[PDB]
Swiss-Prot record:
Biological source species: Haliotis rufescens (California red abalone)
Subcellular localization(s) per the UniProt record: Cytoplasmic vesicle, Secretory vesicle, Acrosome lumen
Identification of the protein by name: Egg-lysin
Tissue expression profile of the protein: Sperm (at protein level).
Function text: Creates a 3 um hole in the egg vitelline layer through which the sperm passes. Does not have enzyme activity. Species-specific interaction between the sperm protein lysin and the egg protein VERL exposes a basic surface on lysin that may dissociate the egg vitelline layer via electrostatic repulsion. Plays a role in ensuring species-specific fertilization.
InterPro entries from the UniProt entry: Egg_lysin, Egg_lysin_sf
Length: 134
Protein backbone atom coordinates (compact mmCIF):
# COMPACT_ATOMS: atom_id res chain seq x y z
CA UNK A 1 0.00 0.00 0.00
CA UNK A 2 2.74 2.45 0.99
CA UNK A 3 6.54 2.50 1.07
CA UNK A 4 9.42 4.87 1.75
CA UNK A 5 12.02 5.87 -0.83
CA UNK A 6 15.45 5.03 0.59
CA UNK A 7 18.67 5.01 -1.45
CA UNK A 8 21.01 2.14 -0.41
CA UNK A 9 24.72 2.89 -0.04
CA UNK A 10 25.77 -0.77 0.04
CA UNK A 11 23.80 -1.70 -3.09
CA UNK A 12 25.69 -4.25 -5.19
CA UNK A 13 24.67 -4.21 -8.87
CA UNK A 14 26.45 -7.51 -9.59
CA UNK A 15 24.42 -9.32 -6.93
CA UNK A 16 21.23 -7.67 -8.21
CA UNK A 17 21.41 -9.42 -11.59
CA UNK A 18 21.85 -12.81 -9.88
CA UNK A 19 18.71 -12.14 -7.84
CA UNK A 20 16.84 -10.89 -10.91
CA UNK A 21 17.58 -14.09 -12.86
CA UNK A 22 16.21 -16.30 -10.06
CA UNK A 23 13.08 -14.15 -9.83
CA UNK A 24 12.53 -14.25 -13.60
CA UNK A 25 12.77 -18.06 -13.73
CA UNK A 26 10.14 -18.41 -11.00
CA UNK A 27 7.85 -15.88 -12.69
CA UNK A 28 8.16 -17.74 -16.00
CA UNK A 29 6.55 -20.88 -14.56
CA UNK A 30 3.31 -18.99 -13.99
CA UNK A 31 3.63 -17.29 -17.38
CA UNK A 32 3.19 -20.56 -19.30
CA UNK A 33 0.15 -21.40 -17.15
CA UNK A 34 -1.53 -18.16 -18.25
CA UNK A 35 -0.56 -18.93 -21.85
CA UNK A 36 -2.38 -22.28 -21.66
CA UNK A 37 -5.64 -20.40 -20.95
CA UNK A 38 -5.62 -17.71 -23.68
CA UNK A 39 -3.15 -19.44 -26.00
CA UNK A 40 -5.76 -20.29 -28.64
CA UNK A 41 -6.55 -16.58 -29.06
CA UNK A 42 -3.07 -15.25 -28.29
CA UNK A 43 -1.79 -12.91 -31.02
CA UNK A 44 1.87 -12.60 -32.06
CA UNK A 45 2.22 -9.20 -30.35
CA UNK A 46 0.43 -10.40 -27.19
CA UNK A 47 3.21 -12.90 -26.48
CA UNK A 48 5.84 -10.15 -26.70
CA UNK A 49 3.58 -7.77 -24.74
CA UNK A 50 3.40 -10.27 -21.86
CA UNK A 51 7.18 -10.04 -21.37
CA UNK A 52 6.72 -6.30 -20.86
CA UNK A 53 3.85 -7.01 -18.44
CA UNK A 54 6.08 -9.39 -16.46
CA UNK A 55 8.67 -6.63 -15.99
CA UNK A 56 5.97 -4.22 -14.78
CA UNK A 57 4.64 -6.96 -12.50
CA UNK A 58 8.10 -7.53 -11.04
CA UNK A 59 8.49 -3.80 -10.30
CA UNK A 60 5.07 -3.71 -8.60
CA UNK A 61 5.72 -6.97 -6.73
CA UNK A 62 9.09 -5.64 -5.52
CA UNK A 63 7.29 -2.92 -3.55
CA UNK A 64 5.76 -5.56 -1.25
CA UNK A 65 9.15 -7.10 -0.42
CA UNK A 66 11.00 -3.75 -0.53
CA UNK A 67 10.02 -2.82 3.04
CA UNK A 68 10.77 -6.29 4.39
CA UNK A 69 14.03 -7.08 2.55
CA UNK A 70 15.56 -3.79 1.30
CA UNK A 71 14.72 -1.66 4.36
CA UNK A 72 16.29 -4.15 6.78
CA UNK A 73 19.41 -4.65 4.63
CA UNK A 74 20.01 -0.91 4.23
CA UNK A 75 19.43 -0.20 7.94
CA UNK A 76 21.72 -3.06 9.02
CA UNK A 77 24.46 -2.06 6.59
CA UNK A 78 25.29 -5.71 5.95
CA UNK A 79 26.09 -6.90 2.42
CA UNK A 80 24.32 -10.23 1.65
CA UNK A 81 26.03 -12.65 -0.74
CA UNK A 82 24.65 -14.46 -3.81
CA UNK A 83 23.60 -17.46 -1.70
CA UNK A 84 21.64 -15.21 0.66
CA UNK A 85 19.90 -13.52 -2.28
CA UNK A 86 18.99 -16.81 -3.99
CA UNK A 87 17.03 -17.83 -0.87
CA UNK A 88 15.16 -14.52 -0.95
CA UNK A 89 14.46 -14.94 -4.66
CA UNK A 90 12.71 -18.26 -4.07
CA UNK A 91 10.31 -16.58 -1.63
CA UNK A 92 9.69 -13.74 -4.10
CA UNK A 93 9.04 -16.17 -6.95
CA UNK A 94 6.75 -18.25 -4.74
CA UNK A 95 3.91 -15.73 -5.04
CA UNK A 96 2.75 -15.16 -8.62
CA UNK A 97 -0.44 -13.32 -9.56
CA UNK A 98 -0.35 -12.24 -13.22
CA UNK A 99 -4.15 -12.51 -13.39
CA UNK A 100 -4.48 -9.54 -11.01
CA UNK A 101 -2.46 -7.27 -13.32
CA UNK A 102 -4.43 -8.41 -16.37
CA UNK A 103 -7.79 -7.94 -14.63
CA UNK A 104 -6.84 -4.47 -13.34
CA UNK A 105 -5.43 -3.44 -16.74
CA UNK A 106 -8.52 -4.73 -18.56
CA UNK A 107 -10.86 -2.96 -16.12
CA UNK A 108 -9.31 0.46 -16.84
CA UNK A 109 -8.85 -0.47 -20.54
CA UNK A 110 -5.35 1.05 -20.66
CA UNK A 111 -3.88 -1.33 -23.23
CA UNK A 112 -0.58 -0.02 -24.72
CA UNK A 113 0.02 0.02 -28.48
CA UNK A 114 2.07 -2.87 -29.86
CA UNK A 115 5.22 -0.98 -30.85
CA UNK A 116 8.38 -2.55 -32.38
CA UNK A 117 10.56 -0.45 -30.06
CA UNK A 118 8.97 -2.01 -26.97
CA UNK A 119 9.45 -5.46 -28.49
CA UNK A 120 13.16 -4.73 -29.00
CA UNK A 121 13.49 -3.62 -25.37
CA UNK A 122 12.02 -6.92 -24.14
CA UNK A 123 14.45 -8.83 -26.37
CA UNK A 124 17.39 -7.07 -24.66
CA UNK A 125 19.38 -9.17 -22.17
CA UNK A 126 17.96 -8.79 -18.58
CA UNK A 127 21.49 -8.14 -17.29
CA UNK A 128 21.72 -4.97 -19.40
CA UNK A 129 18.19 -3.86 -18.45
CA UNK A 130 18.14 -1.37 -15.50
CA UNK A 131 15.52 -1.82 -12.78
CA UNK A 132 13.48 0.84 -11.00
CA UNK A 133 11.10 0.78 -8.03
CA UNK A 134 7.54 2.11 -8.01
Amino acid sequence: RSWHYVEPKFLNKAFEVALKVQIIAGFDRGLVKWLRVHGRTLSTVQKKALYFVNRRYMQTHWANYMLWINKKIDALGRTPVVGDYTRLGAEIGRRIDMAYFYDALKDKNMIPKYLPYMEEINRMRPADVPVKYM
